[PDB]
Symmetry: C3
């Protein structure tokens, strides 16, 4: 109970999965301070999951333990602990990629199922590794159990990495949708850019004003804004950019800043 353990998944909210994972954790670490991020990441989207954990890592105190489980390839992908000034407990499938931009890494461990089972006492399922591997590992780490006790160290440079950088051709960026929020605001992977006056969505016949807040255009109008995530956000004031553009996470857009 010294540090927080955060949870990010695509498991969904209807059913037992999250509760099972939490009770498994609290079994091991009864004083754990378990903080939900989301369990509503778009199904199997390791990209959107990575974005979400990135934002939470940026604001968490050092020593925080982050459990992330978006795991379509569950089965012989590795389960890993990344040990840094913060911890990540994640499938080795590139989920760690964005949060890793903000963590100084000391070491990486592959979790050994046999050694986890020692601590839990129950059969490791083929598919629900949040309950049987990742949650327990997070709880154990926060309890002061060294990853060496349930895993073995592996090279930091061996882990799966997502391709997340945007492309630029001349004055045209080719940007990827990395997150869409419940408003339908659309987050694109452009960061560290000088603020423009205009953002052109070349594929859509739209030249959007770049403004600080939604209420600086009429209701129903589309704009671009900084948002709170240090990327580029496209929004409809009191509406859904995602619906109007018919875009989804992973879609690429041609974008010019003017």
């Amino acid at each position: 109970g010294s540090h927080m353990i955060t949870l990010t998944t695509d498991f969904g909210l209807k059913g037992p999965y999250v509760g099972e994972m939490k009770v498994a954790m609290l079994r091991i670490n009864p004083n754990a301070k378990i903080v939900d991020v989301t369990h509503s990441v778009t199904r199997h989207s390791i990209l959107e999951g990575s974005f979400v954990m990135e934002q939470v890592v940026k604001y968490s105190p050092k020593g925080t333990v982050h459990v992330g489980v978006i795991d379509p390839g569950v089965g012989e992908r590795r389960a890993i602990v990344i040990e840094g000034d913060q911890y990540l407990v994640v499938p080795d499938n590139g989920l760690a990629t964005l949060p890793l931009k903000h963590i100084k890494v000391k070491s990486v461990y592959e979790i050994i199922p046999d050694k986890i089972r020692k601590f839990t006492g129950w059969e490791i399922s083929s598919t629900f590794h949040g309950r049987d591997i990742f949650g327990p590992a997070g709880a154990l780490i926060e309890k002061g159990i060294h990853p060496e006790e349930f895993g073995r160290e592996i090279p930091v440079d061996s882990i799966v990495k997502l391709n997340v950088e945007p492309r630029k051709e001349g004055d045209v960026w080719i940007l990827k949708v990395i997150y869409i929020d419940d408003f339908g605001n659309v987050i694109l992977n452009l960061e560290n850019y000088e603020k423009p006056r205009t953002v052109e969505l070349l594929d859509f016949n739209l030249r959007l004003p770049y403004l600080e807040t939604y209420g600086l255009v009429e209701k129903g109008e589309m704009l671009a804004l900084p948002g709170s995530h240090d990327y580029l956000e496209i929004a409809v004031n009191m509406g859904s950019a995602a619906e109007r553009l018919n875009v989804k996470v992973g879609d690429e857009l041609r974008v010019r800043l003017l």
Copy 2:
């Protein structure tokens, strides 16, 4: 960690916003007892948000701190702390209106961003004031930091108030939909009324029996009931009144009690 801090937002559940706000809070107040109400208030509905906080305030113990963030007009609206036998930490946009029916107010403070930034250490975003202003203020207040330290007192009668009272013309009430729940039950702003035998929805050709519970009519039938909120509830037994009537929050209905 002496009193509860409740959270009510329209931020949604898919993404990092709620987790960011929580970790920001726990940074400041590691022992905070943070209780989620909802983050699924209808987008930008200050009215439905106010209703939801009203119901939670009614059942919370004195000293409880209520953070509410439904903030379409974020940008030069004020961020305020209402100091009473309970606290409200809200945008000055009328969200406080219904909960204020149940709080004895001592004083009101405008939060000064510059003074909050002193405590957090990070740049205040243009749009995510839950993370950068409201959550921190709630955490600070519960930690025993006086609002005077990060704000300045303003008159209680200067704050934005929602128009929430129903209208009556003769024997006809003109009622507003203030909440629709996940069942599609429809809550109308009529309170403190003598229970009728019948509730006529004049616009809809319906004369509904007023009954204590859903199971007192056949499945699929519509009724009116008291519910648990001290308003008037319209429901379909095992169905959705909202869908059948095609109504939304803010819609007005002509209603007669017989």
Copy 3:
């Protein structure tokens, strides 16, 4: 705060209901460790609720208190406490049936509303017994208040039980859908079966491979798998079996194992 109190409901996430119930609980038991399972059980589905509590009970430590509220028949159904090596606080409507497979029961109590009101102080509503009866009873039990103090013992064999066993005709099972998760994976009430090589959905013209993980078939293909729940799961790799089969909880399917 010695043991966990878990919460499973169909109340939904949009609105005040869950927050009200939690603040009522924490009023009574300020140190309660309240663990959300789900509030997104399919409306009024006592069957799916029972499944969800079953899975959480299986992984909770002894002494855990489980509050379950899926209560379409609220009104003269009983409110009960099941006292065992774990506790259940539930409507007497068969919600307890699946979790009871995993609990050694000592005694059962009917909650007496008048005696609960002694402890809460407020009027018991006709419909929101989570806030006014079940949550308080859970909080009180975890606080060390004996059920005898707010109820009266009743025979364990008098409580409502769901019919949950599958039927078999020759080599054909008639299985019921007991849960559908957020992926659209479909859980059928077949347990304790020898793993087949093939699962035929006789009604659908499908002969599915039985495999350990989703990624063992092409994307879009349907399979059967063990899952993590000790039942039988039907899934589309990276899709929705529920949508493809057009099935809902309670639907019955003819199924042959080959």
